[PDB]
Amino acid sequence: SGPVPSRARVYTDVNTHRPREYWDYESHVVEWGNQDDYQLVRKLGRGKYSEVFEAINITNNEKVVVKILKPVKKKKIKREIKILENLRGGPNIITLADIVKDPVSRTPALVFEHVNNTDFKQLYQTLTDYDIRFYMYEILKALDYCHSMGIMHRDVKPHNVMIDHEHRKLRLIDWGLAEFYHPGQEYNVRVASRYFRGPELLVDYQMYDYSLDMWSLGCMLASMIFRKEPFFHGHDNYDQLVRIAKVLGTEDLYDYIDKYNIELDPRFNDILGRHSRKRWERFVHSENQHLVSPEALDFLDKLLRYDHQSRLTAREAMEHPYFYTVVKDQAR
Ligand SMILES: [Cl-]
Known part of the structure; x- marks a missing residue:
C-alpha cells in the first residue's frame, strides 16, 4: 500500500x-518567425536554461527580450511554447512574441515583450x-x-x-x-x-x-x-x-x-x-x-x-x- x-x-x-x-505539447508543431527580424542590442543576463538579451525588432523598431535557449530536449521547448501560447493575453502573463532559430547553429530563441x-x-x-x-x-x-x-x-x-x-x-x-x-x-x-x-x-x-x-x-x-x-x-x-x-x-x-x-x-x-x-x-x-x-x-x-x-x-x-x-x- x-x-x-x-x-x-x-x-x-x-x-x-x-x-x-x-x-499534448509533444505533438505541438512550432511556428517559426524570421530570426533576421531581430538585432541583438546587449546582454541582459544569464539563466540556468538561457542567455537573455535585449533586441530590436527591425521591422517595427519594437524593443523585445530574446531568450536564446541552452540545449534542452525539444519536448521541453514545445511545452514552454505551448503553455506561453495557451496563456497569451492572460492577466499579467508575459507575452511570447516570436520564436526563432539560428539557421547555422540551430539554436532556438524565444522572443518576448519587453x-x-x-x-x-x-x-x-x-x-x-x-x-x-x-x-x-x-x-x-x-x-x-x-x-x-x-x-x-x-x-x-x-x-x-x-x-x-x-x-x-x-x-x-x-x-x-x-x-x-x-x-x-x-x-x-x-x-x-x-x-x-x-x-x-x-x-x-x-x-x-x-x-x-x-x-x-x-x-x-x-x-x-x-x-x-x-x-x-x-x-x-x-x-x-x-x-x-x-x-x-x-x-x-x-x-x-x-x-x-x-x-x-x-x-x-x-x-x-x-x-x-x-x-x-x-x-x-x-x-x-x-x-x-x-x-x-x-x-x-x-x-x-x-x-x-x-x-x-x-x-x-x-x-x-x-x-x-x-x-x-x-x-x-
Ligand atoms: Cl488555484
Missing part, C-alpha cells in the same frame, strides 16, 4: 475537457505595505488564470515576477518549468528552487497540483513582509523541510504524512525531530513591522500549510481581507 492519491481541489478536469492538442524591470534586490527595499498587497494581488491574477487554464507555474519566486514599478506593471515570467495539471499524474518534485518548494515536493509526493504555486507564493510573501530573502533557507532538500518544520511544527507535518501515507525518506527520521509550531511574531522587528499586519499574518498562515489541499486557492486568496483596500482602489 503506497501513498494516498490526490486530485486538485479546483480546476481539476479543465484539461480533460479541452481538445487533446491544448495540453518589461522595464526594477531589480527586486533594489525594489523590495522601497516597497510599501500597500505595494506588497497590490503586487501580490496582481500575481494572484496571473496564478488564478494559469490554474484555470490547467497549468501549474511550478517556479513562483521573486526572480520570476518582473515589476515595472513606475507604471505599476507586473508580469509573471519564465514558464519553462510549468506543466499541465492532469488528475492522477505524477510529476517531478525537483524542478524549481528548493527555497520555494512545498512540503509535498520535499517528501517526494508526486501527485501534486496547482496548490504548489500557493506555497511558493506564501514563501514570497513571507520574504517580502519580513524582509528575509529567502524565508526558508535550507541547505538541501532535506534541510529545507527541517527549516519549514522549525516554523510550522512537526505535528502538522506528521499528520500530513500519515494522511497521505507518505513513505518518508529514512534520512528525515533523524533530522526532523520534534518542533512546536511557532508564532509569526518572532520574525517581526523594527525594520519590517510597517509591512506586517494581522491580515498579512492571517493570509500568510493560510498559504503555508503542509496539506496542499488546505491551502487557499488563488481565487480564495484574492478574497482575503489583506487585499480589501487594493480591491476597492482597483474598482474605482
Whole structure:
C-alpha cells in the first residue's frame, strides 16, 4: 500500500475537457518567425536554461527580450511554447512574441515583450505595505488564470515576477518549468528552487497540483513582509523541510504524512525531530513591522500549510481581507 492519491481541489478536469492538442505539447508543431527580424542590442543576463538579451525588432523598431535557449530536449521547448501560447493575453502573463532559430547553429530563441524591470534586490527595499498587497494581488491574477487554464507555474519566486514599478506593471515570467495539471499524474518534485518548494515536493509526493504555486507564493510573501530573502533557507532538500518544520511544527507535518501515507525518506527520521509550531511574531522587528499586519499574518498562515489541499486557492486568496483596500482602489 503506497501513498494516498490526490486530485486538485479546483480546476481539476479543465484539461480533460479541452481538445487533446491544448495540453499534448509533444505533438505541438512550432511556428517559426524570421530570426533576421531581430538585432541583438546587449546582454541582459544569464539563466540556468538561457542567455537573455535585449533586441530590436527591425521591422517595427519594437524593443523585445530574446531568450536564446541552452540545449534542452525539444519536448521541453514545445511545452514552454505551448503553455506561453495557451496563456497569451492572460492577466499579467508575459507575452511570447516570436520564436526563432539560428539557421547555422540551430539554436532556438524565444522572443518576448519587453518589461522595464526594477531589480527586486533594489525594489523590495522601497516597497510599501500597500505595494506588497497590490503586487501580490496582481500575481494572484496571473496564478488564478494559469490554474484555470490547467497549468501549474511550478517556479513562483521573486526572480520570476518582473515589476515595472513606475507604471505599476507586473508580469509573471519564465514558464519553462510549468506543466499541465492532469488528475492522477505524477510529476517531478525537483524542478524549481528548493527555497520555494512545498512540503509535498520535499517528501517526494508526486501527485501534486496547482496548490504548489500557493506555497511558493506564501514563501514570497513571507520574504517580502519580513524582509528575509529567502524565508526558508535550507541547505538541501532535506534541510529545507527541517527549516519549514522549525516554523510550522512537526505535528502538522506528521499528520500530513500519515494522511497521505507518505513513505518518508529514512534520512528525515533523524533530522526532523520534534518542533512546536511557532508564532509569526518572532520574525517581526523594527525594520519590517510597517509591512506586517494581522491580515498579512492571517493570509500568510493560510498559504503555508503542509496539506496542499488546505491551502487557499488563488481565487480564495484574492478574497482575503489583506487585499480589501487594493480591491476597492482597483474598482474605482
Ligand atoms: Cl488555484
